[PDB]
Amino acid sequence: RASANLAATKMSECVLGQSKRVDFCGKGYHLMSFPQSAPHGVVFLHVTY
């Protein structure tokens, strides 16, 4: 549940917006993120500058 809450927060702040939070959306300055479904989980492709 903690992991899924983190995943929901990353979907909200990282896919549905651009995050100023450092390293919340991977190495560098966050540009955007793309979600992908995985068996019992989520995979975020973080596009950063």
Partner 1 sequence: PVSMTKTSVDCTMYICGDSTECSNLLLQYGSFCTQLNRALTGIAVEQDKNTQEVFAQVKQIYKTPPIKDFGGFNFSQILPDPSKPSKRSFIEDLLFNKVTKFNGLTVLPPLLTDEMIAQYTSALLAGTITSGWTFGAGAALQIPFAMQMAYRFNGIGVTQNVLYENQKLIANQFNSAIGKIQDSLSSTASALGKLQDVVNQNAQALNTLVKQLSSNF
Partner 2 sequence: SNVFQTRAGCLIGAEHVNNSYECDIPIGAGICASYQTSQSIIAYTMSLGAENSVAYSNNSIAIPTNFTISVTTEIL
Q: Which does 40 bind (CB under 5 to 8 A by kind): partner 2, a second copy, partner 1, none?
A: partner 1
18-38: b or e for each residue (b if 16 or more CB lie within 10 Å)? ebeeeeebeeeebeebeeeee
Among 12, 28, 34, 45, binds a second copy (CB under 8 A): 12
Residue 39 CB-density burial (10 A; 0-12 exposed, 13-18 middle, 19+ buried)? exposed
Q: Does 19 bind partner 2 (CB under 8 A)?
A: no
Q: Interface residues with partner 1 (CB under 8 A)?
A: 1, 3-5, 7-8, 11-12, 15-18, 20, 22-23, 27-43, 45, 47, 49
